[PDB]
C-alpha cells in the first residue's frame, strides 16, 4: 500500500543484496556506504597505471545457489569464468612440481570426488586413503543435525577422533582450512570443513570454481546499484554511520552520519562487519543476549598480495592453486584467469597471505620478501627472491586485520538471526545465521534473509510509522 | 474387574515393584511386603552419616531395555536417565593409565555403527583378529531364537574356540564383557548370555547405548513406583519379612506368615524374592515337583561393590562407564562426574564392581580396599598410589552380596521357571524367572510384567476360588 523506507548501513555484498531484494519487493532502500568504493571485502581500486588491486582473491563455487540466482537475475552469468573441474596443489617436498585432483565430468557426485582421490597417487598413500574414507563415511551420511554437533571440535581434533591420519590433516586439510577462513586446522571449527566438503557430495559441479571476469565494484557491485536505483532505491558513498540514535523506548530514532546528517526510515539494517557493529551498539542494547553473544565473533587478519612481473611466466595455470606453504594460502596468475586483467607479455600473481596475525603489523617490503621466498619454491626456475630471474615491476599489499569472523569452535550459537529483538532494527552480513559460511554466498544469502524478514514484518513496520506521526 | 484381586507379593525389588505396578494398572489390589527398611533389593542404596549415598551395585541402563524404557515413560521419569556418549571405553593393562575405545557413529545404523567401531579401533584388535572375530560371530548374529537357546550348552571360552575367534580376543574383549554381565569369567559363563548381550549391538541403533540413573535408586526410581501403586489402592510395607509359606490341606497357599507371626492372606500369592531365598522357603510338599526341584541349578553369584571418596577431583576421568580389564575389578565409574545427585566439583568418588568375588566376600573391608587401591594405581598411575602418596581416601563403603544374580553357567535355561507355578494361586517374579533379557534390571521389570499378566489371565479362576 505504502513502500517502506529502509536505511541500510554498509554496501558490501550483504547490504547490496538486502537493497536488491527490498527494491524487488517494491520498497525504498537507502544504502549508505562509509567508503568511496562498493563491495566491502570484495572492493578493488585502480592505481595510477590503470591496474586494479583487490581486497582479496575471490572464488565463486557451483555450490553457491544464491550467488547463481543473483547473477542470473541481473543477467551477468557470462561474467563468471568457470575453470576446469580440478584441485591443483603444490608439492612442498618437490619444488616446482604440482599434484591435482581431477573430477571426471562423466561421473556424478560424490563418485567424481572419490575417483579424484583414488586416481591421485602423490598426495595420499593407499592405507591413508582407506583411513580417510573410514573417518569421513559417517560424516557424509550425516544430516544437518550431525554437522551442527561438530561445531564443538577443531579440524585437527575431529580428524584424530575419526582416525583420519595426521599426515592427511597436515597435507590436505591445512590447505582447505587456510582457504576457507585463513587459519590452520588446529584452530578452525570442523563445522566449517563439513559445509565445504558438502560441495563435493551434493551437486555434481558444487566444487567447480569460477573467477569474476574483472574488478568486483564495476563487474558485480555496479549491476546491483543500477538495479536498485532503477526501482527507486538510493545508493550513497562516503556515508559512514557515526551513531545509532535511540528513542526513549529503546528503538532506533535515526542513524547519525559522520557529517552530522540524520537519516530516518521505517526500518533500519546494519550490513556492516560484526567488529564495526559491536563498537556502534548503543549502551542500552549491550546486555541483550543477541548483542552480548557477538563478543565471540572477532574478525580474522588476512593480507592480499599482488605482484606484477616483467616477464610472462612460462609455467602457470588458468586456475586457482593451493601453495601448501606455511606463509601463503591460495594464489592465481590473474593475467591468465581474469579477462579484464589479461596481459600476454606481463604476468601478475594475486596471493592470499594466511595466517596473517604476526604479519599485518609488518612492513610491505617485509611481506613482499616473505612472498618472494615462497614463490622461489613454487617457481624455482622462474622466480628468485633477489630478482635474479623474473623482476618485480610493482606490488600492492592490501591488509584486512579484521576480515571475516574467525570461525573457531562454538561460534554458531552466537550468530544472530537477521531479525533483531529491537523492533525495526535488522542485521545483514556473512557473520549472521545462514548455512553457507563467512563467504560471498553467505553475504548474499544473509541479505536475501534480511529483506525477507523486513517484508514479513511489513504490517507491523507500516503501523509503527503512523503511530509515531500522532 | 467385577471384584479386584488381593495379591500378596514377597519382595520389593524391581520384580516385586513391577508386579505391583502392573497389577494396580489392571485394577487389582497388590500388597507388596519388603523384608528390609529399604526398597529396590539388588538396586538398594543407603545414606550414611555425612549424607553420602552408597549402592548395592553400579547399575547401567541400556537402550535395548524396552520394558525399563516403558516403565520410566509410564511414570514420566525419562529425564532421570543420564544417557552417555555411544562409546565403550576400555583400559590398557599393558599400558598403565592409557585407555582404548569403540566409538559408535550416530549417523550409521545398527550393526554398521558397531562394525565401524571395531574397524576404527586399532589398539585392541589386529586386522587378522578382526577378520577371524567377524567370521566367528556372523553366523551367530544372523541366527534365530532357537539357535541362541542351543548355545546354552557351551561356555564362552568353549564356543569362541569352536567358531575360530582368536584366544586373545576372548581374553582381551570377552573377559571384560563376561564379568560385566554376570561377575564371572568366560570359562564359566554360558554363551547364551553373551549372545543376548551382543544382540543389543545389532537390533536397535542405540541398543548398546548406556545410561546412569541421576541419583540413588530407592528415591529416584523405587519411590515413583511406590507412589503410583499407593495412588491406585495398593499397599507397600517395609520390614515385612516372610518367615513361612503356610499351606492349606490340599497343598495351595493358606497365608504368608511374617517374622512377627502376622498372617497375610490374598486371592493370589507372588514370590518376587531372589531364587536362593525362595529355595529355602519352599514347603516340603512342593520340594519334589519338577518346577521347584529344577531351581537347585540356579545359585546366586558373589559380588562386591566398592565406593571410594578421594580428597582431590581426579584430572583424568570420564563422564562414562569404564572396563578396568583387571583380574580383580570389573566395570567402574567416577560417580562425581556421571551421577547428577552425586556430583561434586572438588571431590571425586569411584564406584567399582569387584568381580570374581568368590575368594573375596569372606575377606575384610581393609583387605578389599587394599586390593582395589593396588588396581587403581594401574588405572591412575600419576593420580592414585596404594600407600596414599598421591590422592588420599576420605572414606569408603564396601557392599558385599555373596548371593546376587543367579550364576549363568551352561544349562540353566531349562531350570528357569515360568511366572505361573503348578500351584494354583502361587506365582513367581524375579530376574531368574523365564524371560529373554538375562539376570538384569530389564529382566526383573519384564518378569514383573509377565507375572502380573499371568495373574490377570487367571482372574476368572482366582475370583471363583475366593468365594
Ligand atoms: C582475502 C579475502 C579472500 C576471500 N576469498 C573469498 C573466496 O574465495 N570466496 C568467497 O566466497 N568469499 C571470500 N572472501 C569473503 C568475502 O569477501 C566476504 O565473506 C563478504 O564479501 C562479506 O560480505 P559482507 O557484505 O557481509 O561484509 P563487507 O563486504 O565487509 O561489507 C560491509 C560494508 O560496510 C561498510 N561499513 C563499515 N562501517 C560502516 C559504517 N559505520 N557506516 C556505513 N558503512 C560502513 C564497509 O565499508 C563495507 O563496505 C574473502 C575475503 C577476503 C578478505
Ligand atoms: C553389583 C551389581 C551390579 C549390577 N549391575 C547391573 C547393571 O549394570 N545393569 C542391570 O541391568 N542390572 C545390574 N544388576 C542386576 C540387578 O540389580 C538385578 O538383576 C535386579 O535388581 C534383581 O531384581 P529382582 O527384583 O528380581 O531381585 P531383588 O532386587 O534382589 O529383590 C528381591 C527383594 O526381596 C526381598 N526379600 C528377600 N527375602 C524376603 C522375604 N523373606 N520376605 C520379603 N521380602 C524378602 C529382598 O530384600 C529384596 O528387596 C547388578 C547387580 C549387582 C548386585
Ligand atoms: C573467506 N571465505 C572463503 C574463502 N575462500 N574459499 C575457498 C576458495 C578456494 C578454495 C576453497 C576450498 F576448496 F578449499 F574449499 C575455498 C571459501 O570457500 C570461503 Cl567460504
Ligand atoms: C548383573 N547383570 C548385568 C550387569 N551389568 N551389565 C552390563 C553393564 C555394563 C556393561 C555391560 C556390557 F557392555 F558388557 F554388556 C553389561 C548387564 O548388562 C547386566 Cl545384564
Curated annotation (Swiss-Prot), chain A:
Its EC number is 1.3.5.5. Substrate binds at residues 199, 438. The chain holds residues 102 to 571 of 578 of the full protein. The gene is PDS1. Changing residue 61 to V: Shows less than 5% activity of that of the wild-type. Confers norflurazon (NFZ) resistance. Remains flavinylated. One of its GO terms (molecular function) is phytoene dehydrogenase activity. Its cofactor is FAD. Optimum pH is 6.0. It catalyses: 2 a plastoquinone + 15-cis-phytoene = 9,9',15-tri-cis-zeta-carotene + 2 a plastoquinol. Changing residue 437 to F/R: Shows less than 5% activity of that of the wild-type. Confers norflurazon (NFZ) resistance. Remains flavinylated. FAD binds at residues 14, 33-34, 41, 58-59, 64, 241, 430, 440. This is 15-cis-phytoene desaturase, chloroplastic/chromoplastic. Inhibited by the herbicide norflurazon (NFZ). One of its GO terms (biological process) is protein homotetramerization. Active with decylplastoquinone (DPQ) as substrate. Also active with other benzoquinones, which are strongly preferred over naphthoquinones as substrates. Belongs to the carotenoid/retinoid oxidoreductase family. One of its GO terms (cellular component) is chromoplast.
Amino acid at each position: 500500500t505504502k513502500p517502506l523506507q529502509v536505511v541500510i548501513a554498509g554496501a558490501g555484498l550483504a547490504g547490496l543484496s538486502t537493497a536488491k531484494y527490498l527494491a524487488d519487493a517494491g520498497h525504498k532502500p537507502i544504502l549508505l556506504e562509509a567508503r568511496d568504493v562498493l563491495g566491502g571485502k570484495i572492493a578493488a581500486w585502480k592505481d595510477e597505471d590503470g591496474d586494479w588491486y583487490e581486497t582479496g582473491l575471490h572464488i565463486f563455487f557451483g555450490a553457491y545457489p544464491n550467488i547463481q540466482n543473483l547473477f542470473g537475475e541481473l543477467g551477468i552469468n557470462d561474467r563468471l569464468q568457470w575453470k576446469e573441474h580440478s584441485m591443483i596443489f603444490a608439492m612442498p617436498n618437490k619444488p616446482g612440481e604440482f599434484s591435482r585432483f581431477d573430477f571426471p565430468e562423466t561421473l556424478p557426485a560424490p563418485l567424481n570426488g572419490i575417483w579424484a582421490i583414488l586416481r591421485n597417487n602423490e598426495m595420499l598413500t593407499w592405507p591413508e586413503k582407506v583411513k580417510f574414507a573410514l573417518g569421513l563415511l559417517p560424516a557424509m551420511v550425516g544430516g544437518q543435525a550431525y554437522v551442527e554437533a561438530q561445531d564443538g571440535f577443531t579440524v585437527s581434533e575431529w580428524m584424530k577422533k575419526q582416525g583420519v591420519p595426521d599426515r592427511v590433516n597436515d597435507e590436505v586439510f591445512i590447505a582447505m582450512s587456510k582457504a576457507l577462513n585463513f587459519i590452520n586446522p588446529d584452530e578452525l571449527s570442523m563445522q566449517c570443513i563439513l559445509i565445504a566438503l558438502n560441495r563435493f557430495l551434493q551437486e555434481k559441479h558444487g566444487s567447480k570454481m569460477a573467477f569474476l571476469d574483472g574488478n568486483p565494484p564495476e563487474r558485480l557491485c555496479m549491476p546491483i546499484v543500477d538495479h536498485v536505483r532503477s526501482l527507486g532505491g538510493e545508493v550513497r558513498l562516503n556515508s559512514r554511520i557515526q551513531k545509532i540514535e535511540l528513542n526513549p523506548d529503546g528503538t532506533v530514532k535515526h542513524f547519525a552520519l559522520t557529517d552530522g546528517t540524520q537519516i530516518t526510515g521505517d526500518a533500519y539494517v546494519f550490513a556492516t562487519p560484526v567488529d564495526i557493529l559491536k563498537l556502534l551498539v548503543p549502551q542500552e542494547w549491550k546486555e541483550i543476549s543477541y548483542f552480548k553473544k557477538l563478543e565471540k565473533l572477532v574478525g580474522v587478519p588476512v593480507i592480499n598480495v599482488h605482484i606484477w612481473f616483467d616477464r610472462k611466466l612460462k609455467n602457470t595455470y588458468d586456475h586457482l592453486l593451493f601453495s601448501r606453504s606455511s606463509l601463503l594460502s591460495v594464489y592465481a596468475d590473474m593475467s591468465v584467469t581474469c579477462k579484464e586483467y589479461y596481459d600476454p607479455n606481463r604476468s601478475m600473481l594475486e596471493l592470499v597471505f594466511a595466517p596473517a596475525e604476526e604479519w599485518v603489523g609488518r612492513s610491505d617490503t617485509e611481506i613482499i620478501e616473505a612472498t618472494m621466498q615462497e614463490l622461489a619454491k613454487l617457481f624455482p626456475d622462474e622466480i628468485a627472491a633477489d630478482q635474479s630471474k623474473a623482476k618485480i615491476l610493482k606490488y600492492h599489499v592490501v591488509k584486512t586485520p579484521r576480515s571475516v569472523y574467525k570461525t573457531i569452535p562454538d561460534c554458531e550459537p552466537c550468530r544472530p538471526l537477521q531479525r533483531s529483538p529491537i523492533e525495526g532494527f535488522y542485521l545483514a552480513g556473512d557473520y549472521t545465521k545462514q548455512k553457507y559460511l563467512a563467504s560471498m554466498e553467505g553475504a548474499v544469502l544473509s541479505g536475501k534473509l534480511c529483506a525477507q524478514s523486513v517484508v514479513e514484518d511489513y504490517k507491523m513496520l507500516s503501523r509503527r510509522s503512523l503511530k509515531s506521526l500522532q
